[PDB]
Amino acid sequence: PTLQRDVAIVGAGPSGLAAATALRKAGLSVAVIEARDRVGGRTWTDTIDGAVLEIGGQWVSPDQTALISLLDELGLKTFERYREGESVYISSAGERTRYTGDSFPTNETTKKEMDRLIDEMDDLAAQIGAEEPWAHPLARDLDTVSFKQWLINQSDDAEARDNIGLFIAGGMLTKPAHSFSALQAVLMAASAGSFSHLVDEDFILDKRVIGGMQQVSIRMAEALGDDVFLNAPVRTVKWNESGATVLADGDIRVEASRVILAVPPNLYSRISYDPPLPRRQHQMHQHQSLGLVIKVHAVYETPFWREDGLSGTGFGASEVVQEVYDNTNHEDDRGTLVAFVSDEKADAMFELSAEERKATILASLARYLGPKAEEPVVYYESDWGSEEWTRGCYAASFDLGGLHRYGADSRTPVGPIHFSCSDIAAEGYQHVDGAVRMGQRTAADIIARS
Amino acid sequence: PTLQRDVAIVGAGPSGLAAATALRKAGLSVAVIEARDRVGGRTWTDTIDGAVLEIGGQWVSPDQTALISLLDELGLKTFERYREGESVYISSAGERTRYTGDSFPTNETTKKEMDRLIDEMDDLAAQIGAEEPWAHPLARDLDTVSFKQWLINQSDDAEARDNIGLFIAGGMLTKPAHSFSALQAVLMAASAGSFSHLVDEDFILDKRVIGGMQQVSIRMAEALGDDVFLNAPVRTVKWNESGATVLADGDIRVEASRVILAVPPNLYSRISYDPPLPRRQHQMHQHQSLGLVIKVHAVYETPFWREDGLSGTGFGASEVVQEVYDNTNHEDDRGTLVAFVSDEKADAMFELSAEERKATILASLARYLGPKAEEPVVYYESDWGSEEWTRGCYAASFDLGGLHRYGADSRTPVGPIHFSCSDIAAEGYQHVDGAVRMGQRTAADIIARS
Numbered sequence: 001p002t003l004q005r006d007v008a009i010v011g012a013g014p015s016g017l018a019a020a021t022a023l024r025k026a027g028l029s030v031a032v033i034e035a036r037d038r039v040g041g042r043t044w045t046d047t048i049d050g051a052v053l054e055i056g057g058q059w060v061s062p063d064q065t066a067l068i069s070l071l072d073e074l075g076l077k078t079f080e081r082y083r084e085g086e087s088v089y090i091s092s093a094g095e096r097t098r099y100t101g102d103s104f105p106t107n108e109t110t111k112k113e114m115d116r117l118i119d120e121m122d123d124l125a126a127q128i129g130a131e132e133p134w135a136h137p138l139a140r141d142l143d144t145v146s147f148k149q150w151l152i153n154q155s156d157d158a159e160a161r162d163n164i165g166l167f168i169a170g171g172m173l174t175k176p177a178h179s180f181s182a183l184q185a186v187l188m189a190a191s192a193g194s195f196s197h198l199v200d201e202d203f204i205l206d207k208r209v210i211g212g213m214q215q216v217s218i219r220m221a222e223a224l225g226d227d228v229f230l231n232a233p234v235r236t237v238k239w240n241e242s243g244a245t246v247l248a249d250g251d252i253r254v255e256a257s258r259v260i261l262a263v264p265p266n267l268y269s270r271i272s273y274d275p276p277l278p279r280r281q282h283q284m285h286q287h288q289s290l291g292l293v294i295k296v297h298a299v300y301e302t303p304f305w306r307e308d309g310l311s312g313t314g315f316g317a318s319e320v321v322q323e324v325y326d327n328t329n330h331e332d333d334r335g336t337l338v339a340f341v342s343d344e345k346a347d348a349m350f351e352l353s354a355e356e357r358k359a360t361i362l363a364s365l366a367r368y369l370g371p372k373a374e375e376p377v378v379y380y381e382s383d384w385g386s387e388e389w390t391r392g393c394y395a396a397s398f399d400l401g402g403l404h405r406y407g408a409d410s411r412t413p414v415g416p417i418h419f420s421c422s423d424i425a426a427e428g429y430q431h432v433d434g435a436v437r438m439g440q441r442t443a444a445d446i447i448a449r450s
Numbered sequence: 451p452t453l454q455r456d457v458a459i460v461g462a463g464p465s466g467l468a469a470a471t472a473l474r475k476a477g478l479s480v481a482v483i484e485a486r487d488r489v490g491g492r493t494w495t496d497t498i499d500g501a502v503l504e505i506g507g508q509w510v511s512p513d514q515t516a517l518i519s520l521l522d523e524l525g526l527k528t529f530e531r532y533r534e535g536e537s538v539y540i541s542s543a544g545e546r547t548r549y550t551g552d553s554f555p556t557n558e559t560t561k562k563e564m565d566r567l568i569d570e571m572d573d574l575a576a577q578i579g580a581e582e583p584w585a586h587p588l589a590r591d592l593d594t595v596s597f598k599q600w601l602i603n604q605s606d607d608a609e610a611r612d613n614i615g616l617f618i619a620g621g622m623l624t625k626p627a628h629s630f631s632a633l634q635a636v637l638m639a640a641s642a643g644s645f646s647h648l649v650d651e652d653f654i655l656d657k658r659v660i661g662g663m664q665q666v667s668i669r670m671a672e673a674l675g676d677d678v679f680l681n682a683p684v685r686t687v688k689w690n691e692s693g694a695t696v697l698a699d700g701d702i703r704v705e706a707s708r709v710i711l712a713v714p715p716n717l718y719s720r721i722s723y724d725p726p727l728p729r730r731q732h733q734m735h736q737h738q739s740l741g742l743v744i745k746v747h748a749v750y751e752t753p754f755w756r757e758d759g760l761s762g763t764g765f766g767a768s769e770v771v772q773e774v775y776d777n778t779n780h781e782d783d784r785g786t787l788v789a790f791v792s793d794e795k796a797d798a799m800f801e802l803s804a805e806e807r808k809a810t811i812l813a814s815l816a817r818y819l820g821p822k823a824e825e826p827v828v829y830y831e832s833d834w835g836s837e838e839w840t841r842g843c844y845a846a847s848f849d850l851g852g853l854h855r856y857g858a859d860s861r862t863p864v865g866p867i868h869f870s871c872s873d874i875a876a877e878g879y880q881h882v883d884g885a886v887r888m889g890q891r892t893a894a895d896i897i898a899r900s
């Protein structure tokens with residue numbers, strides 16, 4: 001077909017659907033043109049070997065007020081990750097300690113250096129913010145030193161530095177700490193409300209969606225009916241000052257006044273622009289790259305770790321698997337774990353065969369929770385890197401130096417072309433809440449323009 | 451044959467030969483009955499693929515005054531290990547730094563904790579001594595805690611503790627720090643004159659023997675002529691209050707007034723005693739075990755590292771190879787390295803094939819000295835563990851708790867049976883100088899008895 005709308009939206013992940021929702025509410029027409037056979041993008045619930053898994057994003061935290069509002073508006077309810085009993089810490093030397101409380105069971109020197117680092121990061125985050133960290137007068141100094149070098153300059157304590165990196169590098173940006181700047185760490189902290197928020201798994205990994213996070217996108221997409229187009233990769237955006245024509249597979253052709261490119265930034269150059277985007281965009285987009293993390297899912301006859309007095313939460317910056325949590329489905333009698341293998345360690349596991357890789361990862365899970373972790377009934381690894389319409393995970397960030405160099409331009413419309421994804425968000429950066437915020441912000445921009 | 455002597459000496463390593471030498475000087479007759487086809491025991495020079503190597507012990511330090519006296523008496527001269535230029539340090543994180551000076555190029559916290567640990571060890575060594583560390587009133591407290599636990603109680607700094615262990619555990623006792631006590635570390639330090647002596651490779655690995663250390667034993671054995679018997683494993687010691695009959699392969703039978711068992715203590719029970727030794731000995735001997743270390747020898751067309759401004763000395767407590775030094779032969783134009791792989795890391799390398807093991811070790815040498823270390827013209831690994839008449843290296847020590855429990859009995863004659871090896875020595879413990887001292891001490895004991 002060919003059709004005419006106020007706004008063509010490329011991508012039906014949560015940012016594109018949030019924008020579509022808001023645009024409709026204010027009386028604008030939309031088409032949402034989506035490449036895959038489903039909506040949700042980096043959120044995806046599927047049944048794998050008889051187990052319902054959240055293959056993509058899943059967690060809701062208390063700072064994420066725009067997602068929490070939306071969940072309400074869609075009739076979605078939440079439940080909390082299980083947290084009773086003891087967590088497990090694996091030291092830099094490989095020693096396992098069960099513990100409770102807000103600090104890791106390390107030697108006192110490391111424990112004092114960690115608290116100091118956490119406080120300094122909280123102070124920087126509070127002063128610098130997530131809206132425009134590049135405009136702060138500290139921006140150039142912080143953005144031209146890697147987070148690894150900045151940590152070394154702050155502290156002689158190797159274990160504290162490794163644990164501080166655990167929460168930002170493997171835990172959030174999913175890139176090695178040598179490869180991103182101290183200002184990018186500060187933005188990551190500020191975006192979650194504080195660095196202390198990223199340290200506390202009871203805050204950042206607090207709740208999940210009954211029904212699964214993919215329902216958020218599914219329900220916004222339902223409300224839009226035939227205005228959503230699936231299995232339609234956008235190939236071409238012809239534009240001028242008055243409008244755009246979007247062309248997609250299946251001979252689709254949408255003529256609209258504005259376009260929202262609601263895709264992560266590494267994928268912008270998948271589309272031919274006619275005329276080309278400006279030099280500024282051609283350069284900036286090359287400096288954006290997603291991280292890499294394997295989300296590991298292991299399903300067992302029972303949550304066996306609870307019988308041992310454990311919450312299922314483990315942290316070990318020196319393990320192949322640096323984080324493991326109880327991810328048992330709501331109302332399920334079977335126990336499920338989720339675990340993460342980040343950046344260069346994800347590279348290293350993908351070099352092994354799937355069978356050696358599984359055994360390696362399960363051996364690491366057994367160091368936290370015991371040998372029963374090696375006998376799951378369903379094992380699955382999310383594999384977002386293989387997916388041409390994602391190509392990595394959780395989210396995209398600048399290379400070292402790119403945030404201060406290009407950050408102020410990362411949300412700017414090129415004439416009728418607008419940009420909206422979690423990867424360029426302020427609060428909620430890299431998460432569903434940031435996709436939602438950015439979709440709503442882009443809608444209000446377009447609305448006021450009209 | 452059958453023969454009669456004042457003293458039968460079992461073993462022609464340096465302790466047994468030193469004892470034989472001294473006994474002759476005072477007018478006593480001896481036979482020295484040796485199992486292998488050569489003298490020297492744990493000292494052995496051989497030509498391997500056209501390169502002269504010191505397969506066993508080799509180094510002389512300035513504290514080793516009884517060996518230095520002996521070298522003089524035998525006309526042997528010494529030369530110093532090459533030490534010009536920069537050393538290499540590999541950190542707990544795997545970072546290589548070239549340096550000079552007396553301290554490692556670590557962060558300042560680790561550097562301050564190392565100096566403190568070194569001082570405390572020096573103080574304990576000075577107060578406790580190497581003659582009878584079990585008689586000090588601190589002996590029980592220090593001997594019932596492992597050196598690993600004692601270090602943890604002294605310091606929160608993982609890198610300092612690992613480096614302190616490098617000098618005692620992998621560097622000397624060749625057992626893991628969890629397996630021996632703090633009192634055994636203190637004895638090791640005291641035996642070399644101080645712990646600072648064990649830290650400074652320019653002291654403890656100062657000189658070598660022109661001609662090779664095996665010449666020390668060869669020349670004492672020469673002076674004894676036909677009184678040395680080779681290829682004669684001792685099988686049986688029949689004894690009573692008046693004397694002993696020693697029986698060895700080749701139908702040898704020595705009737706003597708006293709016997710010196712000049713073998714490391716793990717081998718005492720290779721010989722049948724008639725009547726059996728006392729309970730005290732039957733128990734004590736079971737608590738003595740040699741360590742394990744692979745002495746790696748790599749020969750190159752030139753000492754190539756000198757062209758890069760390096761001494762060839764490297765330290766890396768977290769590497770498979772923890773120590774590497776310039777071991778170039780005196781007057782040789784070809785460069786030779788010596789390196790060490792200790793205890794559980796030696797176990798781990800012996801589980802690989804000889805070819806994977808070689809490649810592993812050379813890869814580690816290349817982390818210190820660059821890729822040219824992977825292209826040697828002769829590669830050889832000393833393999834003392836396979837040798838039935840040694841079975842490990844450098845030397846034997848008590849299990850955890852054995853030093854205080856049994857140390858006071860470790861040099862006591864059983865009637866006509868005397869004990870003499872480096873492994874029970876005081877100054878020079880575990881080294882050729884301690885074998886020499888013990889041989890001389892045993893001679894003077896026997897002499898005064900007569």
Ligand SMILES: Cc1cc2nc3c(=O)[nH]c(=O)nc-3n(C[C@H](O)[C@H](O)[C@H](O)COP(=O)(O)OP(=O)(O)OC[C@H]3O[C@@H](n4cnc5c(N)ncnc54)[C@H](O)[C@@H]3O)c2cc1C
Pocket residue numbers: 010011012013014015016033034035036039040041042043055056057058059060232233234235262263264267270271295382384389390392393394395420421422423430431432433435
């Ligand atoms: C393993 C993993 C776990 C995660 N866990 C969490 C979590 O616990 N909590 C949290 O908040 N967030 C989490 N996230 C992140 C969250 O999933 C993403 O931030 C959010 O989904 C991004 O939303 P988006 O709308 O900005 O982009 P996407 O979700 O990536 O949507 C982009 C959409 O555009 C489509 N598209 C791309 N190119 C084209 C084209 N040319 N033509 C047409 N369509 C196109 C894609 O197919 C896709 O549907 C996780 C992410 C991953 C990968």
Ligand SMILES: Cc1cc2nc3c(=O)[nH]c(=O)nc-3n(C[C@H](O)[C@H](O)[C@H](O)COP(=O)(O)OP(=O)(O)OC[C@H]3O[C@@H](n4cnc5c(N)ncnc54)[C@H](O)[C@@H]3O)c2cc1C
Pocket residue numbers: 460461462463464465466483484485486489490491492493505506507508509510682683684685712713714717720721745832834839840842843844845870871872873880881882883885
């Ligand atoms: C790889 C390695 C490197 C070393 N480096 C150094 C160093 O650099 N500096 C240093 O001072 N020391 C070093 N040493 C230690 C030194 O070599 C030993 O401490 C010293 O050789 C021990 O002397 P011994 O006379 O006490 O025993 P040994 O040298 O072991 O002599 C024991 C002798 O008794 C024989 N024997 C055993 N059982 C019988 C039997 N039943 N019948 C007959 N004969 C028997 C053996 O064959 C052997 O010849 C090193 C040792 C090794 C293994």
